[PDB]
Amino acid sequence: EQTYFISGANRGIGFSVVQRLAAKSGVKVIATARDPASATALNELAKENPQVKVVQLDISDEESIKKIAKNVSQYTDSIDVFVSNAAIAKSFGPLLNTPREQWIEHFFTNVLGPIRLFQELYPLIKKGTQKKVFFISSNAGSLNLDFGLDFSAFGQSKAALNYSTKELARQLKPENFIVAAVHPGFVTKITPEESAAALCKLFESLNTTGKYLSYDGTELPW
Amino acid sequence: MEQTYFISGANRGIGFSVVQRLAAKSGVKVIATARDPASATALNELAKENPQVKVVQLDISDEESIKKIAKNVSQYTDSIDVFVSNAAIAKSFGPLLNTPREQWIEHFFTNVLGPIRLFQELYPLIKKGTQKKVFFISSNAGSLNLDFGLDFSAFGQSKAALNYSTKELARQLKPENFIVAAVHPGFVTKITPEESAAALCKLFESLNTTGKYLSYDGTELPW
Numbered sequence A: 001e002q003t004y005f006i007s008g009a010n011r012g013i014g015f016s017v018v019q020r021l022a023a024k025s026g027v028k029v030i031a032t033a034r035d036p037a038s039a040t041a042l043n044e045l046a047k048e049n050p051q052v053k054v055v056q057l058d059i060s061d062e063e064s065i066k067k068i069a070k071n072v073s074q075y076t077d078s079i080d081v082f083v084s085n086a087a088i089a090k091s092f093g094p095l096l097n098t099p100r101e102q103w104i105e106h107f108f109t110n111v112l113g114p115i116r117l118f119q120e121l122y123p124l125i126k127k128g129t130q131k132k133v134f135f136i137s138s139n140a141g142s143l144n145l146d147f148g149l150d151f152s153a154f155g156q157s158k159a160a161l162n163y164s165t166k167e168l169a170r171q172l173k174p175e176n177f178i179v180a181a182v183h184p185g186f187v188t189k190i191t192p193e194e195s196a197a198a199l200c201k202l203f204e205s206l207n208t209t210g211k212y213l214s215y216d217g218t219e220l221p222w
Numbered sequence B: 001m002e003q004t005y006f007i008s009g010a011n012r013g014i015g016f017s018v019v020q021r022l023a024a025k026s027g028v029k030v031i032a033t034a035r036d037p038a039s040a041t042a043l044n045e046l047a048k049e050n051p052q053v054k055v056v057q058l059d060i061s062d063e064e065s066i067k068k069i070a071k072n073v074s075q076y077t078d079s080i081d082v083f084v085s086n087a088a089i090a091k092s093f094g095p096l097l098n099t100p101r102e103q104w105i106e107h108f109f110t111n112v113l114g115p116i117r118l119f120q121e122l123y124p125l126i127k128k129g130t131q132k133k134v135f136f137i138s139s140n141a142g143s144l145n146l147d148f149g150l151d152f153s154a155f156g157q158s159k160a161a162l163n164y165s166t167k168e169l170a171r172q173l174k175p176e177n178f179i180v181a182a183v184h185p186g187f188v189t190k191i192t193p194e195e196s197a198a199a200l201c202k203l204f205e206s207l208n209t210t211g212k213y214l215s216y217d218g219t220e221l222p223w
């Protein structure tokens, strides 16, 4: 039996991942929402598949992160596969036109949030069997891709977390952790369904650390 | 053909050495900043002997200080030819699990937001100058593609984050004929601040291409 943890499971790719894991036998899922009482789809997911555990997490909120280990510990002794999915993408375009609040929000939500979350949940991952750690990144976060778009605070935040993900992969290799940054795809666009199926395949199959992977299993340049 | 340079963090280190270097060049006005000018002994003595050097207050962690830098710099000049974001911190190294919340925050505000805000406020002054050059003092530690077998924690992340945004800015301002660079000033191979400042000042003067990540010696670094 394996415990997966998924932040931001109330809608989008996160809901799609939880819905697919729920179908796989011997999988417990800790699923988070900012507001689990409004998370209508996820609550019915969990009611029909009670191996899905619905927990409060706001990744912008240090008081919420300071509770996540307790909240997860209610349902499990360990985490096999940790997935930092919950994130924002509110600010694009030129730097001269990106205000202070946009830079601050993407940093706290998209960089600090996931680092604090991983810090809080490391003890539980440590005790699990798979020791897999996924941060949902974006190809927009590469220092070495040109989309003909500016990504402002969004891109900056994905590049920032990518830098720390790379370091974390190095730091935990001695502990046999598998650490990855994964672009979930453009969800040519793709459905949350497709993104999620590809994401679950990669989560199960990935056997080496320090990779930056697109959903299809191919590598991206940091 | 008089030029104006702006150097943040000129009270000590590389920044002091850059201002000292520029102070020796004929036709070069230097706006030099310190968080606490009253205690900037060496920079004040330089400025007392060399009236081309203007000392102004700036705390790049402090939005209230940033909201004032443009009007304060404008008392001393109508334009900036060469903008150098040098002031920065480096206090957070080693593993992610040992780096507390406050270190990630401080490096973001001082090393990412500060320089971005400082550039936002000084852009009109720079647009009005001739050279239109914009330097961010980065680190080779900020590269997503260099391995030094060291952890750089929040310091490294802050330099990578500012690098990402520097690369974007170079694209955005290419049509306005700006030159934008991230520059590694060296390990201050061990070099002195004065050695770094001599190399940096040659590079500021000579660089005629935008979007480069460079070392002090003018060689390129991978993003």
Ligand SMILES: NC(=O)C1=CN([C@@H]2O[C@H](COP(=O)(O)OP(=O)(O)OC[C@H]3O[C@@H](n4cnc5c(N)ncnc54)[C@H](OP(=O)(O)O)[C@@H]3O)[C@@H](O)[C@H]2O)C=CC1
Pocket: A007, A008, A009, A010, A011, A012, A013, A014, A015, A033, A034, A035, A057, A058, A059, A060, A061, A084, A085, A086, A087, A088, A089, A109, A136, A137, A138, A139, A183, A184, A185, A186, A187, A192
């Ligand atoms: N979709 C795409 O094409 C691309 C997206 N990505 C990555 O994909 C992920 C998006 O996943 P998906 O669920 O489909 O996205 P959605 O846009 O559908 O929604 C974002 C998710 O994050 C949650 N969330 C937002 N802010 C917070 C917060 N402060 N605290 C807690 N939860 C929060 C949302 O919950 P709530 O409903 O409460 O807001 C929701 O679950 C991101 O990690 C992003 O980096 C990367 C590249 C492109």
Ligand SMILES: NC(=O)C1=CN([C@@H]2O[C@H](COP(=O)(O)OP(=O)(O)OC[C@H]3O[C@@H](n4cnc5c(N)ncnc54)[C@H](OP(=O)(O)O)[C@@H]3O)[C@@H](O)[C@H]2O)C=CC1
Pocket: B008, B009, B010, B011, B012, B013, B014, B015, B034, B035, B036, B058, B059, B060, B061, B062, B085, B086, B087, B088, B089, B090, B110, B137, B138, B139, B140, B185, B186, B187, B188
């Ligand atoms: N030294 C090296 O080997 C390397 C240096 N660098 C970069 O080179 C640049 C210069 O480094 P170095 O001279 O050694 O730095 P120092 O540590 O010697 O000093 C940094 C400078 O920034 C100022 N400063 C710090 N915080 C603030 C703030 N909140 N507001 C305004 N000014 C501030 C300091 O003023 P105060 O006296 O008030 O603290 C000082 O003038 C930095 O951007 C640094 O990151 C990068 C990698 C290698």
